């Protein structure tokens, strides 16, 4: 059972889309650092990874809609796609953010994205 790595990551996804920072932080590390496609450390602790998402969360317009989370040991793949405003239509973007937890806390967290898309060119 990784139930344990399964606990930050639920939450985390739901608070999102949510708009609960507490619950988005708590399931971090104190010292977790915070990665960008493809290895560009933004944060090295968790008070620079909750500041840099709660600008994300200033959009009215942000929702991580899920598609697929798949978990190996202590590590998991969160498969969403971000709802955002792109000046060419909708601004959905398909995003695998990767999470790995030691002690019960999210120690290294990474995201890469996958590519720009909208509504008007997409079925």
């Given at each position: 059972?990784?139930?344990?790595?399964?606990?930050?990551?639920?939450?985390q996804?739901?608070?999102?889309?949510?708009?609960?920072?507490?619950?988005?932080?708590?399931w971090?590390a104190?010292?977790?650092?915070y990665?960008?496609?493809?290895?560009?450390?933004?944060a090295?602790?968790?008070?620079?990874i909750r500041?840099?998402?709660?600008?994300?969360?200033?959009?009215?317009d942000?929702?991580?809609?899920?598609?697929?989370?798949?978990?190996?040991?202590?590590?998991?793949?969160?498969?969403e796609?971000?709802?955002?405003?792109?000046?060419?239509?909708?601004?959905?973007?398909?995003?695998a953010?990767?999470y790995?937890?030691?002690?019960?806390?999210?120690?290294?967290?990474?995201?890469?994205?996958?590519?720009?898309?909208?509504?008007?060119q997409?079925?």
């Amino acid at each position: 059972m990784n139930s344990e790595i399964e606990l930050p990551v639920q939450k985390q996804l739901e608070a999102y889309n949510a708009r609960d920072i507490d619950a988005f932080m708590a399931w971090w590390a104190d010292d977790c650092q915070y990665y960008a496609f493809p290895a560009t450390l933004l944060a090295g602790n968790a008070a620079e990874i909750r500041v840099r998402h709660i600008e994300r969360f200033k959009e009215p317009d942000l929702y991580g809609e899920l598609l697929t989370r798949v978990i190996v040991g202590n590590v998991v793949i969160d498969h969403e796609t971000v709802t955002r405003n792109f000046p060419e239509g909708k601004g959905e973007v398909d995003v695998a953010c990767i999470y790995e937890v030691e002690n019960g806390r999210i120690a290294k967290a990474w995201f890469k994205i996958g590519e720009p898309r909208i509504v008007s060119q997409k079925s």
